[PDB]
Design a protein around this ligand. Structure first.
Ligand SMILES: CCCS(=O)(=O)Nc1ccc(F)c(C(=O)c2c[nH]c3ncc(-c4ccc(Cl)cc4)cc23)c1F
Length: 247
């Protein structure tokens, strides 16, 4: 069992919030990250609901997948993981790399994503802010345990699939290769939701830089396919990036 008894974790600085819960930095045999679930008091039925989600995190052992370390039931429900120094991929790309590094970041993410799907785990919300650059070198994918820019057309209108995860990866590719989010010119949610859902809108690939491996863009566009079944699986995506990487 991976339950961490009450009192063992010293919760510190509040880092940020989300629909799910609040993230703090903590102390448990060194630095940890504690996600306080937005649940004052847990019902026995909520308790099982929690265990089921932990049982899914329980089967993630990979260097590119955020390290799940433990879970709390008291005081309140919480997920304990490793502490990632630096910032999210979002903060680097948009808030504050060499083309080689960009590929590496893109490469590690595929490793993590392929591992997850091999474990038959659909992230369901892959985006640059759920990708943490620990030490600014290693990629840590979390929050698989709002943002519509990474949502596949079939998701907007078995909606959630490995293939919709692939699309979210394509957008991530777009972030890396352009250094900016899709539909930046169009700052209207309902507009993007309406236009991408019907197939009239797609990321502008004229933004990618010349110094972008044009083996990538083919792959990017392959993952950004409007049609679900026209997308390559992650094994393919991994092999591809790995093969176009050797250079
Ligand atoms: C392992 C899978 C468990 S999950 O429930 O699916 N995901 C899951 C579960 C618990 C979490 F605490 C977190 C999480 O958020 C973080 C874990 N370590 C971190 N280190 C730094 C930052 C950070 C620091 C500073 C800025 Cl500015 C931004 C982020 C954020 C986190 C998480 F993503």
């Amino acid at each position: 069992d991976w339950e961490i008894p009450d009192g063992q974790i010293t919760v510190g600085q509040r880092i940020g919030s989300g629909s799910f819960g609040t993230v703090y930095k903590g102390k448990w045999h060194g630095d940890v990250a504690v996600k306080m679930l937005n649940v004052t008091a847990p019902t026995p039925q909520q308790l099982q609901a929690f265990k089921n989600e932990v049982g899914v995190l329980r089967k993630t052992r990979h260097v590119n997948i955020l390290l799940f370390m433990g879970y709390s039931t008291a005081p309140q429900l919480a997920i304990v993981t490793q502490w990632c120094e630096g910032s999210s991929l979002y903060h680097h790309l948009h808030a504050s790399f060499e083309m080689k590094k960009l590929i590496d970041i893109a490469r590690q993410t595929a490793r993590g994503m392929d591992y997850l799907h091999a474990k038959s785990i659909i992230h369901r919300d892959l985006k640059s802010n759920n990708i943490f650059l620990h030490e600014d070198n290693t990629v840590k994918i979390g929050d698989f345990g709002g943002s519509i820019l990474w949502m596949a057309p079939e998701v907007i209108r078995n909606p959630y699939s490995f293939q919709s995860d692939v699309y979210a990866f394509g957008i991530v590719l777009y972030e890396l290769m352009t250094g900016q989010l899709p539909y930046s010119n169009i700052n209207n949610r309902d507009q993007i939701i309406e236009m991408v859902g019907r197939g009239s809108l797609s990321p502008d690939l004229s933004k990618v830089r010349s110094n972008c491996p044009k083996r990538m863009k083919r792959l990017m566009a392959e993952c950004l396919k409007k049609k679900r079944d026209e997308r390559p699986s992650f094994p393919r995506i991994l092999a591809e990036i790995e093969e176009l990487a050797r250079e």
